[PDB]
Amino acid sequence: GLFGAIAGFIEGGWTGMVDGWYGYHHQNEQGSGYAADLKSTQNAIDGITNKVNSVIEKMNTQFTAVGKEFNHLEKRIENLNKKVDDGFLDIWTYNAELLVLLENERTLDYHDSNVKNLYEKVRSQLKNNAKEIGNGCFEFYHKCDNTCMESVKNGTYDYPKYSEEAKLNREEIDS
Amino acid sequence: PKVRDQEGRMNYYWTLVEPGDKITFEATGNLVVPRYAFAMERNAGSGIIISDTPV
Numbered sequence A: 001g002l003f004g005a006i007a008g009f010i011e012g013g014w015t016g017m018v019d020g021w022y023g024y025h026h027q028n029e030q031g032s033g034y035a036a037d038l039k040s041t042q043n044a045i046d047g048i049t050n051k052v053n054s055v056i057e058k059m060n061t062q063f064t065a066v067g068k069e070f071n072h073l074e075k076r077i078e079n080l081n082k083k084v085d086d087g088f089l090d091i092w093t094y095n096a097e098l099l100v101l102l103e104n105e106r107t108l109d110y111h112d113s114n115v116k117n118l119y120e121k122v123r124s125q126l127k128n129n130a131k132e133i134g135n136g137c138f139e140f141y142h143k144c145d146n147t148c149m150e151s152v153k154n155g156t157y158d159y160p161k162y163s164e165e166a167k168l169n170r171e172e173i174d175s
Numbered sequence B: 001p002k003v004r005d006q007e008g009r010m011n012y013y014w015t016l017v018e019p020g021d022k023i024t025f026e027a028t029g030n031l032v033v034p035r036y037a038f039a040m041e042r043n044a045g046s047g048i049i050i051s052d053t054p055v
């Protein structure tokens, strides 16, 4: 991975998350489960769809008959006609092969960037109220119910609200 | 040399006559006169497909 998130510090993907491309696995006393981040998933789908549409829609053609008929005394123009067809075949094949090769690399890195951004967005929200434990995972120093959980998914986590609750727990785990 | 049991040759010709035009034929012999003529309007483009695929 270019950004080191997919197949990087997040070692593997989740098959339990089927409603989206990127999301979360939560765990609290109320239970545990998988959920997909609606905001980041939809913004990545739009880019990919635009990417596919751009490749296809920019190719606009018109009515044209390739077939040309020549006699046995018109070899040179027949060879000229063949030279035109073969040259177009080589040009289109090389561009099409390289376009897919380069864009496939771009698409995978695009997913890598989105996963990395989502982790950093959560990191900026929690700050020192949570401990990074690898695998793209956070451990809360304070209790976090279902309302607190989706509030991170909402994007509306209240750091000062649990700042003193987490700070007291922070200085006791580390002896 | 005999081609389909023929030693004589027959060269065929064609031309297009625009509206408001006259075509004149003159010969003392060795002429194959037309019998049927086609009135047509060419469509620009298109080609000819040579294959055994049914339609």
Ligand SMILES: *[C@@H]1O[C@H](CO)[C@@H](O)[C@H](O)[C@H]1NC(C)=O
Pocket: A146, A147, A148, A150, A151, A154
């Ligand atoms: C944020 O998530 C909590 C979890 O239930 C909810 O109380 C609150 O309404 C959510 N905010 C939204 C959906 O804007």
